[PDB]
Amino acid sequence: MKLILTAEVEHLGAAGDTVEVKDGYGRNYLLPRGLAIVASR
Amino acid sequence: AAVCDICGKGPGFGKSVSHSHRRTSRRWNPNIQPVRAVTRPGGNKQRINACTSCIKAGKVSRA
RNA sequence: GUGUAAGUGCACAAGGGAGCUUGACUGCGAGACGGACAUGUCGAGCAGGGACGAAAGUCGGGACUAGUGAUCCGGCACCUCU
RNA sequence: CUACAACUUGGUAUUGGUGCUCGAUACGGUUUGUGUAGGAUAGGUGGGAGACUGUGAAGCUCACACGCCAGUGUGGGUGGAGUCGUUGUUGAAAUACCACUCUGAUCGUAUUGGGCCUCUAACCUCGGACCGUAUAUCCGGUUCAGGGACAGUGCCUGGUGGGU
RNA sequence: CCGGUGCUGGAAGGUUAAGAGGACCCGUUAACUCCCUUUGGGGGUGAAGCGGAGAAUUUAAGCCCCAGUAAACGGCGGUGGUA
RNA sequence: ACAGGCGUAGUCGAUGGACAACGGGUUGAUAUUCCCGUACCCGUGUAUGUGCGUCCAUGAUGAAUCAGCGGUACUAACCAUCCUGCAUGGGACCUUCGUUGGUAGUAGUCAAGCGAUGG
RNA sequence: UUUGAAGAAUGAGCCUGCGAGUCAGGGACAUGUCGCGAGGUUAACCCGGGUGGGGUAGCCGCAGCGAAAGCGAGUCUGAAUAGGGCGUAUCCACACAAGAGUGUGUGGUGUAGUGGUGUGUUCUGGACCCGAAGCGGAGUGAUCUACCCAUGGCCAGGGUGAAGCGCGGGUAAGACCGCGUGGAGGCCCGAACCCACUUAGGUUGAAGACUGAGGGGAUGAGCUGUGGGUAGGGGUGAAAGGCCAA
RNA sequence: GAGCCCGGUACGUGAAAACCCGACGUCUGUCUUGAUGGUGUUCCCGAGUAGCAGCGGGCCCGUGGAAUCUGCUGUGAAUCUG
RNA sequence: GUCAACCGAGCGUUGAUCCGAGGAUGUCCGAAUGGGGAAACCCGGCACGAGUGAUGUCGUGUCACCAGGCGCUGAAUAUAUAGGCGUCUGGGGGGAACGCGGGGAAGUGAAACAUCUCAGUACCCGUAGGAAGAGAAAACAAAAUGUGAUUCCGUGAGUAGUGGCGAGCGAAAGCGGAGGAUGGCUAAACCGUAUGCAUGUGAUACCGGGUAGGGGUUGUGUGUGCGGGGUUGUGGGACCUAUCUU
């Protein structure tokens, strides 16, 4: 799902990078540990 | 198994039709998954039953 | 002897041979036979367009009687239908 | 005979990461083009009379490829001032420059699937330890130890099926 | 006695579902093109879009296939001559 | 799916465990139940008497300080092995651990009696 | 009920009561009867203390032919006035045609439906009445019986004499052999107890499975009490299609 | 076998209290910081929804060329020139 | 009171018996609810009273579970939560028919039978109310310059259709009636406010302009709540922007 990055994640991008991710990845790794949040405004 | 703890989605009932058109009763169950949700950012995890549509809608907070 | 059972016929030939040909038609059909009904059977004659024949005329398959399967459902071609 | 239970196959959702290994097309593309009229293995249409050159061209020696080993290309070395043209061939020009590419082995960018080795965070554990708890081989939670995107489950799907 | 039917093991091939794939074709009409008549209908071509039927290709178990197994279910012969 | 199925803690459930009474007499009908004689088992109150304990006291004890010395071993060093350096082993320094003179059987704890829902 | 039964085919002891073509629907067809008549009639509903009044929505007649577009006393098929099919109430008169059966026209004549209700059939309803073995759904049962679980009880009397142990013989030591002790066993005989092999009786029984004589087991895979569990396509079964309240 | 015997009948009358219907009030909310008809543009108009696909249900419609409605499973839009 | 009298005792003009309304009492069981239990019978805790020399005993209240509020505490463990404690308000069960939503037969008919019928019936589950359900067009309709929420009744119609095109099943549009409320409220765009969570050029920033301050009506975001405002099809509404103004 669409989201931007909060911290540095390897093979994805830098902070603030808008990357396209699979729902499993974003729901189970990035969002729960706060490495990213969804794109609203 | 057949009832979602979130939206109340339940099994439907219908018939199973063979080539000879013999109709037999069968059920249509929802795609109910056991998901450890995080109700509050404190971190308490509880095992709940959610349909895959509820997971899709972000309604179950599996944080 | 008549393609093929048997029968009724056929030497006037319906039996044998040759020439041309596609009526093994289209729209029909007075009148009948047989029949519980459904089936089935014969049919002169009229029109179109043809075959053969000098012509008269004959030809809506085969000497005749078996060679077949209702309805439903679906396929194909055409129609100035919806 | 027709069904169904149960068992079983695959797809898909739950369901994620990184790497290797394969296949398709797209883009910068190399590349392959043997009638014969012949300097001669003309792909045609083009803007098409002058271009590459010293970001070192003719003449030679190497590597590889194919090889119709005809010979061509790339890479490097050698050399140091050339090939070329309507050159005359022709439907069709020059292999003098530039503007997509067609018969073909390739590459770097995409996408897309197939397989494999892994990783952990989904998910699972009737493995341990704590807590709810005074009493609890229930249950739930926390945590450690393991599996692990498999399994289980939903939907779709093919088999087996006197078990009914 | 492993020929038959089961069971166990193995896939080198043949066949094979769903799912992926969507060539090709068809319907509709923006646009044109022919008419044929006069107080606009009658023929053809037909982009895109939206639809309908959809082919080649890919794909598992099973079956076919290759073996083993009878204290598995089962089976275990005739004819002629000759001292 | 629902109706419901299981089941933990509990709580019931004798056919079992624990638990104090015998002989005689009597009525028209009851009797280890009533009566007679003699028992035993749980409680309650009063009075009396020994004889313990808190308050009082006496015992029983034991914990902790500083300071006095040897072995672990912050770390630098020595010996020896291993491949300038290296890791190992071993002696000791610092802290630390252990022994003992003052302290602190003084403050401390206990000593009637009940006693588990626990062992 | 039968081809046929006085009966040796069926049923009926007797009497008195009771016991079998009904109802609904503007249903369908036919036929009476009544009203109106090229028209007839309302349904729901509204208003009347009634059985009365209103209510035009519909329905049936009023034109047919054709698959239909459609045309229409015609229409369909067909190239066809060229025949056929269906339709133009029916009759009468007059003509013109034909004697392949009669037709084609011109005048008259003029066409009858519909709504109540009776009756007979009929449709859908249990449909004239009576009569199964069985099939589904939901419940009730293991106080009988089958097996299992917990906890108790019972088995007179008499035999036989395993292992083990001891002593003695024997041997290098044993094996082994005698004598004792011992008291085993889905052991033996036999009452209670549990069965049910034979026979006789009973057979409108004392009894909806018994009685009398005999018979089997009888320390065990025994019998039995109390409490409990398993439920119908299910249970349980040392297996007989047995048992699960005659 | 009763209009004139009795209970009654036609017809009149009757509620302390409770309850039920009305009505008028206290009470409450509410508008008055208000209203009208005009001019050219950005934003909003109900999302895991509609639609689509697979398997079903039900509609006169038994899967049929099968619309409208609906269950489960996947995928998944636009806000009015929608 | 009566069967249903026979007595025996008594009441009533100071109004009985009798009839209506409202109160009081109301053992035990039963949803049964302090705990248990083989319903109607066993054993209690707490508080306050009575009684006894004291124990025994008696009377009156109260003590189930779950759900939802409020308050206190906050395990493993840190944030915290699960849980625990206290206190308030509900629920539980019964009932003939009618309602709504789910699940769902078979006998039967088709002269067999499986699609089909029976029949969405019987039955079952969950839930009501005095009725329920539905209801205010993402509707019909067909070019009529047409109707205008829902429900129910009659027709349309045993029709169009549908069906092993078998047995059978079977609409709607339209039209006539009953009743009428062609009914109401919201969500969003925007404003204002309050707050949670992020931060903050932390100043030239946010009030409607002109003037003067100020470094926060926060400055910016985002989320949520509250109050305005907006309820529409010829589109409507916010944002604007004139004119008119009880």
UniProtKB/Swiss-Prot annotation, chain A:
Protein family per UniProt: Belongs to the bacterial ribosomal protein bL9 family.
Function: Binds to the 23S rRNA.
More about this protein: Binds 2-aminothiazole antibiotics, which are antitubercular agents.
Identification of the protein by name: Large ribosomal subunit protein bL9
Species name: Mycolicibacterium smegmatis (strain ATCC 700084 / mc(2)155)
Lineage summary: Bacteria, Bacillati, Actinomycetota, Actinomycetes, Mycobacteriales
Gene: rplI
